[PDB]
Each structure stands twice: as structure tokens, then as C-alpha cells.
């Protein structure tokens, strides 16, 4: 993997682990602005930050970005999308992502939704 993607992923992950979720999202924005290509680990970490912040709008923007980037089939990314929608209070959207995928149980999706409510 490209060293700059490694570096951004590690900083984003470290900021997430430190509970500095807004700072992780700021780094991700810069990554995209500078033309540095996120990978499935980038998307997973930043969608987790969105889920923990309730940043549904950025989560939906990332969803569109993932769809267009061919990450449509990626298990790591779709798990993170499901987690983001369920923790942002949109079980029906999490269900639609779940139904797109080819493990994860719907019980766990519902549990995540209920525990965030």
C-alpha cells in the first residue's frame, strides 16, 4: 500500500482511538482534497468516526463516494457503512446495505441500532 496512504490511515486510526473524532475527519477531508486515494481501511476508520460522532451527512457523502469508486463489493467498507447508518439511527438504510452484500447477522445490525437509541 502507498506509504502516504499508510501514514494517513495510521494517523486517522490513532486520532479515532484517542477519541479525537473531529480531527480524524479533518485529516480524511485533506486526504481527499490532496488527491490521496482512500482504501477500504481508510473508509472503515472514517465511517467509524462518523458513526461515533453521529456525522450522518458526511457518512452519506462517503457512501456515494464508495459507490462510485467501485468499493461497492468490499466487506470491510460495507460493514462500516452498516455500522454508521445503524448508529446514526437509520435502521432501514443499514438494512439496505446489508441486503446488498453477498458472518454479520441482522441481529447484530439491529442490536447496534437499538443500543445507540
Amino acid at each position: 500500500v502507498a506509504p502516504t496512504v499508510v501514514t494517513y490511515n495510521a494517523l486517522i486510526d490513532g486520532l479515532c482511538k484517542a477519541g479525537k473524532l473531529d480531527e480524524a475527519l479533518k485529516l480524511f477531508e485533506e486526504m481527499v482534497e490532496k488527491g490521496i486515494k482512500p482504501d477500504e481501511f481508510t473508509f472503515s476508520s472514517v465511517l467509524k468516526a462518523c458513526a461515533r460522532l453521529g456525522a450522518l451527512e458526511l457518512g452519506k457523502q462517503i457512501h456515494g463516494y464508495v459507490i462510485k469508486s467501485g468499493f461497492e463489493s468490499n466487506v470491510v467498507v460495507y460493514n462500516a457503512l452498516i455500522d454508521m447508518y445503524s448508529k446514526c439511527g437509520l435502521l432501514e438504510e443499514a438494512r439496505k446495505v446489508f441486503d446488498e452484500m453477498p458472518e454479520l447477522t441482522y441481529r447484530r445490525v439491529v442490536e447496534s441500532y437499538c443500543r445507540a437509541k
Binding site: 490532496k34 458526511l58 457523502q61 457512501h63 462510485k68 461497492e72
Partner: protein, 109 residues
């Protein structure tokens, strides 16, 4: 405060799902994008003017210049799966990606 480059909530990705018995042709999918957009905007002329990009391969959806209130009208329409704010795929070129649509002219990506 944080938004993806190009996401201004006046550009929207509308992802559709199509049948498989049979799967529609590429042209049928494009006609479906325009028909769906025309249903919401009120005319095919306005649909053709405001659809700026689409895909029938990587994704099966279209991208259009509409406001956020208008994007809400797509939810629940037949075949509409996702209604999402669009974003650049090529930030330097301010390019939203997809095959391009210029008021009736298709330019493959």
C-alpha cells in the same frame, strides 16, 4: 463542518436498482434515469438539462443538479435505492466522474 470536495447539496447521486428478468440494456437504463428525473422535475427537457453524469457499469445511477428538497422526492420512487449528495472523484479537475451527459450528448468516461 467537514464535507467532501464537490459536495454542495446541489449535486445528487441517484442510485437505482433494475430487474434481472431480464436485465435492461444500457440504453434502457439511461432512459430510466431520464424518465425518473423527468417525473420529479416535470419535463424531459429539464431532465436532460440537469443530468450531468451517469454510469451503467461501475454503478447504475445518475447524477444531477437539483436542490436538496427536490432530491427528497426521489425516495420511494420505483427503483430508487439511494439518494446521496454527489462528490468529486477527481478533485483537481472538479470532476464528479461517470460517463458525461451534456443535454443529450453522451461522452463515455
Amino acid at each position: 463542518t467537514i464535507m467532501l470536495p464537490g459536495s454542495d447539496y446541489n449535486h445528487w447521486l441517484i442510485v437505482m436498482e433494475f430487474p434481472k428478468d431480464p436485465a435492461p440494456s444500457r440504453d434502457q437504463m439511461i432512459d430510466t434515469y431520464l424518465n425518473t428525473l423527468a417525473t420529479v422535475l416535470g419535463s424531459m427537457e429539464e431532465a436532460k438539462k440537469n443530468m450531468y453524469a451517469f454510469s451503467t457499469t461501475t454503478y447504475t445511477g445518475f447524477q444531477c443538479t437539483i436542490d436538496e428538497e427536490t432530491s427528497e422526492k426521489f425516495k420511494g420512487l420505483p427503483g430508487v435505492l439511494w439518494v446521496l449528495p454527489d462528490s468529486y472523484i477527481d478533485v483537481k479537475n472538479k470532476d464528479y466522474g461517470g460517463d458525461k451527459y451534456i443535454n443529450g450528448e453522451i461522452i463515455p468516461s
